[PDB]
Write an enzyme that holds these catalytic residues in place. Structure first.
Site, PDB file in Angstrom:
ATOM      1  N   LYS A 103      34.150  46.008  43.060  1.00  0.00           N
ATOM      2  CA  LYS A 103      32.815  45.716  42.398  1.00  0.00           C
ATOM      3  C   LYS A 103      33.028  45.565  40.796  1.00  0.00           C
ATOM      4  O   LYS A 103      32.761  46.532  40.503  1.00  0.00           O
ATOM      5  CB  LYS A 103      31.673  46.100  42.747  1.00  0.00           C
ATOM      6  N   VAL A 150      32.545  41.184  43.304  1.00  0.00           N
ATOM      7  CA  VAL A 150      33.497  41.265  44.590  1.00  0.00           C
ATOM      8  C   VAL A 150      34.703  41.301  44.383  1.00  0.00           C
ATOM      9  O   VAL A 150      35.006  39.243  44.637  1.00  0.00           O
ATOM     10  CB  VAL A 150      32.355  42.206  45.269  1.00  0.00           C
ATOM     11  N   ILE A 190      35.787  37.651  46.212  1.00  0.00           N
ATOM     12  CA  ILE A 190      35.057  37.450  47.397  1.00  0.00           C
ATOM     13  C   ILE A 190      33.727  36.398  47.449  1.00  0.00           C
ATOM     14  O   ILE A 190      33.719  35.707  48.231  1.00  0.00           O
ATOM     15  CB  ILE A 190      35.032  38.493  48.129  1.00  0.00           C
ATOM     16  N   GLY A 191      33.115  37.178  46.079  1.00  0.00           N
ATOM     17  CA  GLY A 191      31.879  35.834  45.568  1.00  0.00           C
ATOM     18  C   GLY A 191      30.939  37.475  45.092  1.00  0.00           C
ATOM     19  O   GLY A 191      31.462  38.580  45.077  1.00  0.00           O
ATOM     20  N   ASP A 194      17.278  44.822  51.327  1.00  0.00           N
ATOM     21  CA  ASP A 194      17.991  42.965  51.663  1.00  0.00           C
ATOM     22  C   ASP A 194      18.878  42.846  52.637  1.00  0.00           C
ATOM     23  O   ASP A 194      20.036  42.562  51.997  1.00  0.00           O
ATOM     24  CB  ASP A 194      18.675  42.946  50.216  1.00  0.00           C
ATOM     25  N   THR A 226      24.311  41.460  44.774  1.00  0.00           N
ATOM     26  CA  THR A 226      22.947  41.311  43.805  1.00  0.00           C
ATOM     27  C   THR A 226      23.499  41.723  42.612  1.00  0.00           C
ATOM     28  O   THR A 226      22.159  40.927  41.768  1.00  0.00           O
ATOM     29  CB  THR A 226      22.964  42.264  44.875  1.00  0.00           C
ATOM     30  N   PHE A 268      38.344  48.249  52.426  1.00  0.00           N
ATOM     31  CA  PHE A 268      38.186  47.104  52.392  1.00  0.00           C
ATOM     32  C   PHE A 268      38.435  47.111  54.125  1.00  0.00           C
ATOM     33  O   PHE A 268      38.817  47.109  54.884  1.00  0.00           O
ATOM     34  CB  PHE A 268      39.289  46.054  52.051  1.00  0.00           C
ATOM     35  N   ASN A 310      24.438  41.302  53.768  1.00  0.00           N
ATOM     36  CA  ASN A 310      24.936  42.345  52.703  1.00  0.00           C
ATOM     37  C   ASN A 310      25.694  42.752  54.066  1.00  0.00           C
ATOM     38  O   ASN A 310      25.608  44.730  54.275  1.00  0.00           O
ATOM     39  CB  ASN A 310      23.900  42.471  52.624  1.00  0.00           C
ATOM     40  N   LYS A 330      20.490  41.439  54.747  1.00  0.00           N
ATOM     41  CA  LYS A 330      20.668  40.381  55.154  1.00  0.00           C
ATOM     42  C   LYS A 330      22.367  39.704  55.688  1.00  0.00           C
ATOM     43  O   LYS A 330      22.682  41.260  55.253  1.00  0.00           O
ATOM     44  CB  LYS A 330      20.299  39.266  54.184  1.00  0.00           C
TER      45      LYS A 330
END
Ligand SMILES: O=C1N=C(NCc2cccs2)S/C1=C/c1ccc2ncccc2c1
Lengths: 297, 257
Positions: free
Chosen positions: A36, A21, A13-14, A127, A17, A82, A132, A129
Site C-alpha cells: 500500500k 494497493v 490492484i486498485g 467501512d 480508502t 497477500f 474491504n 463493505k
C-alpha cells in the site's frame, strides 16, 4: 523492518480508502505480498496514522496481517500478507449459482470473529463493505482497510459524522445521533450478509433520504415503540412516509428460520438492542458451520 | 456495554507496554523537570486556543515522555518535539485537526514548516508508529459510570486533577494511568460529595484505597499547593463553566487515611 530492494512489483490492484494497493513478491523468501503506497511529498495523513497504529495491535486470524512499515524519504509503504481477492471482485466473478450457503455461513462466522476482536480492543472499523473484505483460496476471509477506522473510548464521544459508504450506513448515522458505536459495524455486516445471499445490495440508495426510505420500505418506519428517542433525533422528520415491516422470508427468500432470525437481530433499529458480534457467534445459525472452499476465478 | 470489561482489561495490558522510563530526566543532560512543566503547560494553552479534546492533551504528553525516554534533546528543540507530538495527537484523536500551518503559527515562528514535518517523521520512527496509548482520561470516563448517582462537578474535578498530574513528572511518572485516575476520582469524590472510592471499582480494578494511597498522598499535595505552582494554565482553564468552575472549589484539609 525492510528494504524495497527485496520486493518486486507484479501488478496494480486498485485504490482503497487512501493510497494505491499493489501486488508484489519478496525476492528472498518467495512470499507474495500486498503493498500500500502513499505519496507524502501536510505530513503523514491521519488515515495512515490511524491504520498503522491500530493494525499493529490487531493480530487475529480474520483481520488482515500487517507485516512491515517502510518509512523511506517522501514515500511510505505498508506491507501486507497477500491472500487472493476481495469479496467485491469475487461476487463479480461468481456465477449466479456460485456462492453456496455453507460458504456464506462460514464467511459471516469468520467476519463476526474479526469484528468481536476489533470491538474488544476499542476499535471501530466504520467501512465494512465487500471491497474491504478479502478472501483466500482455503476458505478464510479477513477484514481489511482500516483507513477510516478509529479508536473509541468508553463511553463514546461524538466522532466524525461522514462515516460509512452509503449503502451500508446505519440508521443512527443517517438520522445524525450524537453518539454511534460498535453497532454501526454490525449493521454493515447485516447488509453484506443479505448481499451474499441475494447477490444484490440490500439498500442501494443514491442519497441520504433515498437510503433512509429504502430502509423503511424493508424494516418498517421506526417510531417510539420500536426505537425510543427516534422522534427526537436531529434529522428525523414527522413527515416520513409510514411503511409496514415486511416478512424476512420475502426479503431474503433462500434463508432458513435461523438465518432470518440472525439478520433481523443484525438489522435491529435500536443500536442498544442490536446483536453484538460477540453474542452473534453463539446463534443457532452457526450450529453446523464448517470451512468450505471458494472457486478459483 | 458488551465490551466494557474486555476493553478495560486490554487497556491495563497496554498501559504497562506504553509506560515511559521513570527516571529519564536524570539521563537527559540539558533539559529538566522544570522545562517539561513549561512545555506541558504551554500545550494546555494550545489545546484551549484551538478548542481541542482533553484526550489529545494526554496523548501528546504520553508521546513526549516516551520519545524523551530514548532520545536526548537540547532545550531549544524541546518545543519542536512538543509541537510534532501535539500534531500527531490531533491527527489521531480530533475530527477536525488544526492544519500544520497553524502549529507553525503558535511556535512564535521559531521553527519552519519542514522542521515540524521532519520531527513528526522522527517521533513516529521512535514511537515506531505505536500511538493508541491509554491515558488517565480513558480510565476516568470508565470510572464515572460507577457514580451513585452521577455528578457533573465530580467529573470535572477529577479531570482537573488528572490534568494537573501531567505537569510534574516527579513524582507522577512512576504511577500508571489507571492508578492516577483512581486517585483523581477518589479525591474529587471526597471533595464534592464526601464519599469514598466505591466498592464496585475495587471489584473492577483490583485497586484498594491502601494501594492508591501512595499516589493519593502526592496528588493531595498537588491540589493544596496548586495556586502556588509556577504553571497556572490548568487552573485558569478549569474556571470556565464548560468545566463547571471546579478549580475554584476549596481542596479538603485532610483525607482521613
Ligand atoms: O486489499 C486491500 N484493500 C484495501 N483497501 C481497499 C481495496 C480493496 C482492493 C484493492 S484496494 S488495503 C488492502 C491490502 C491487501 C491485503 C491483502 C491482499 N490480498 C489479496 C489481494 C489484495 C490484498 C490487499
Amino acid at each position: 523492518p525492510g528494504s524495497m530492494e527485496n520486493f518486486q512489483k507484479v501488478e496494480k490492484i486498485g485504490e482503497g480508502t487512501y493510497g494505491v494497493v499493489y501486488k508484489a513478491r519478496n525476492k528472498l523468501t518467495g512470499e507474495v505480498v500486498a503493498l500500500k503506497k502513499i505519496r507524502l511529498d501536510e505530513g503523514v495523513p491521519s488515515t495512515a496514522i490511524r491504520e498503522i497504529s491500530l493494525l499493529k495491535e490487531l493480530n487475529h486470524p480474520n483481520i488482515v496481517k500487517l507485516l512491515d512499515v517502510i518509512h523511506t524519504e517522501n514515500k511510505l509503504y505498508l506491507v501486507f500478507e497477500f491472500l487472493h481477492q476481495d469479496l467485491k471482485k469475487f461476487m463479480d466473478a461468481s456465477a449466479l449459482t456460485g456462492i453456496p450457503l455453507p460458504l456464506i455461513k462460514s464467511y459471516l462466522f469468520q467476519l463476526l470473529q474479526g469484528l468481536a476482536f476489533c470491538h474488544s480492543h476499542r476499535v471501530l472499523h466504520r467501512d465494512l463493505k465487500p471491497q474491504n473484505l478479502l478472501i483466500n483460496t482455503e476458505g478464510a476471509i479477513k477484514l481489511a482497510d482500516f483507513g477510516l477506522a478509529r479508536a473509541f473510548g468508553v463511553p463514546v464521544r461524538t466522532y466524525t459524522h461522514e462515516v460509512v459508504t452509503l449503502w451500508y450506513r446505519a440508521p443512527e448515522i443517517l438520522l445524525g445521533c450524537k453518539y454511534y458505536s460498535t453497532a454501526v459495524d454490525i449493521w454493515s455486516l447485516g447488509c453484506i450478509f443479505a448481499e451474499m445471499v441475494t447477490r444484490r445490495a440490500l439498500f442501494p440508495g443514491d442519497s441520504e433520504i433515498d437510503q433512509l426510505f429504502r430502509i423503511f420500505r424493508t424494516l418498517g418506519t421506526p417510531d417510539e415503540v420500536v426505537w425510543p428517542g427516534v422522534t427526537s433525533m436531529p434529522d428525523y422528520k414527522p413527515s416520513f412516509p409510514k411503511w409496514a415491516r415486511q416478512d424476512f422470508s420475502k426479503v431474503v427468500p433462500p434463508l432458513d428460520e435461523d438465518g432470518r432470525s440472525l439478520l433481523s437481530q443484525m438489522l435491529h433499529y435500536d443500536p442498544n438492542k442490536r446483536i453484538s458480534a460477540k453474542a452473534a457467534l453463539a446463534h443457532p445459525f452457526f450450529q453446523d458451520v464448517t470451512k468450505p472452499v471458494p472457486h478459483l476465478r | 456495554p458488551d465490551y466494557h470489561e474486555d476493553i478495560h482489561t486490554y487497556l491495563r495490558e497496554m498501559e504497562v507496554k506504553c509506560k515511559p522510563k521513570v527516571g529519564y530526566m536524570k539521563k537527559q543532560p540539558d533539559i529538566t523537570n522544570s522545562m517539561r512543566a513549561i512545555l506541558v503547560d504551554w500545550l494546555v494553552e494550545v489545546g484551549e486556543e484551538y478548542k481541542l479534546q482533553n484526550e489529545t492533551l494526554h496523548l501528546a504528553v504520553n508521546y513526549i515522555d516516551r520519545f524523551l525516554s530514548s532520545m536526548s534533546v537540547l532545550r531549544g528543540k524541546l518545543q519542536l518535539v512538543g509541537t510534532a507530538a501535539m500534531l500527531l495527537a490531533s491527527k489521531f484523536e480530533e475530527i477536525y485537526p488544526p492544519e500544520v500551518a497553524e502549529f507553525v503559527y503558535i511556535t512564535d515562528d521559531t521553527y519552519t514548516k519542514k522542521q515540524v514535518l521532519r520531527m513528526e517523521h522522527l517521533v513516529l520512527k521512535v514511537l515506531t508508529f505505536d500511538l493508541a496509548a491509554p491515558t488517565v482520561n480513558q480510565f476516568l470516563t470508565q470510572y464515572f459510570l460507577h457514580q451513585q448517582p452521577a455528578n457533573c462537578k465530580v467529573e470535572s474535578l477529577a479531570m482537573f486533577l488528572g490534568e494537573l498530574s501531567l505537569i510534574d513528572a516527579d513524582p507522577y511518572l512512576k504511577y500508571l494511568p489507571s492508578v492516577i485516575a483512581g486517585a483523581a476520582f477518589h479525591l474529587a469524590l471526597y471533595t464534592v460529595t464526601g464519599q469514598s472510592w466505591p466498592e464496585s471499582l475495587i471489584r473492577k480494578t483490583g485497586y484498594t484505597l491502601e494501594s492508591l494511597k501512595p499516589c493519593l498522598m502526592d496528588l493531595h499535595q498537588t491540589y493544596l499547593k496548586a495556586p502556588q505552582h509556577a504553571q497556572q494554565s490548568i487552573r485558569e482553564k478549569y474556571k470556565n463553566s464548560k468545566y463547571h468552575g471546579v478549580s475554584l472549589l476549596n481542596p479538603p484539609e485532610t483525607l482521613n487515611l
